[PDB]
């Protein structure tokens, strides 16, 4: 199916005037492959997947130089934003950035992303057309004007539509065995009787990749939302993901309820029922 490359950056100024934290992680789909951590001070872009560790020293030197450039960039941003909003240095603030590209089943470009957040809220974002910006507040409009005069969108578009896509295909090819896999979820249902009157049916999905999945309950073949609980998809720690959906039902009506599982790895959607 479709694939994506994503970079996520977190820059956190710390209380007082110490040195801010900078974190960069790279993903292909739901598989992380690089990282850079100032609290884990090695000063090198580090591999986190076997298919990227085969890249030569020129690649790692290049990414290391670039990730340091990214780090120093956000180091200025924290100070710039401190001025935009009139904030002292004594406080702790967070700058976040994400960018990347999507490709379809044919590995051709689909969409590009390049967006920022400050203290957990939108700051500025490049729209879908990759030519205009969305400024969340007055401060961000200063960035929008500056970046419009410098034609930043035109430069980022070339990277997102070109460079980003070209290197995603290389990553997908080098990590073909593991990046292009689809692990269908291993599903089962459990039954827990709270009392003589109610019972909880939990529908499990385990060891699936990628993370995208849909778990839904139905009663008599009709969607059921009341008396249900759904947890966030969670990582297993071995590259796969987990998720479950529960519903509280009256004793004797368990057979009315069905669990429906949709996943790209499944040949067909799954329907589970308590036997």
């Amino acid at each position: 199916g479709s694939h994506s490359m994503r970079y996520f950056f977190t820059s956190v100024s710390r209380p007082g005037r110490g040195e801010p934290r900078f974190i960069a992680v790279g993903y292909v789909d739901d598989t992380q492959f690089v990282r850079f951590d100032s609290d884990a001070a090695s000063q090198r872009m580090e591999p986190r997947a076997p298919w990227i560790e085969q890249e030569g020293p020129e690649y790692w030197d290049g990414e290391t130089r670039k990730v340091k450039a990214h780090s120093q960039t956000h180091r200025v941003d924290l100070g710039t934003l401190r001025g935009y909003y009139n904030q002292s240095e004594a406080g702790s603030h967070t700058v976040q950035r994400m960018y990347g590209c999507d490709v379809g089943s044919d590995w051709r470009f689909l969409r590009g992303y390049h967006q920022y957040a400050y203290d957990g809220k939108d700051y500025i974002a490049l729209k879908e057309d990759l030519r205009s910006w969305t400024a969340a507040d007055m401060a961000a409009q200063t960035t929008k004007h500056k970046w419009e005069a410098a034609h930043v969108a035109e430069q980022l578009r070339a990277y997102l539509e070109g460079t980003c896509v070209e290197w995603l295909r290389r990553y997908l090819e080098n990590g073909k065995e593991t990046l292009q896999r689809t692990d269908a979820p291993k599903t089962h249902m459990t039954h827990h009787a709270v009392s003589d009157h109610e019972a909880t049916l939990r529908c499990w999905a385990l060891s699936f990749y990628p993370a995208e999945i849909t778990l839904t309950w139905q009663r008599d073949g009709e969607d059921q939302t009341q008396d249900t609980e759904l947890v966030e998809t969670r990582p297993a720690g071995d590259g796969t993901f987990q998720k479950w959906a529960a519903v509280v039902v009256p004793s004797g009506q368990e057979q009315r309820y069905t669990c429906h599982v949709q996943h790209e790895g499944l040949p067909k959607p799954l329907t589970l029922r308590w036997e």
Partner: peptide, 9 residues
């Protein structure tokens, strides 16, 4: 493959 250029807020 990171962006080669940088832009300041």
């Amino acid at each position: 493959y990171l962006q080669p250029r940088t832009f300041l807020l």
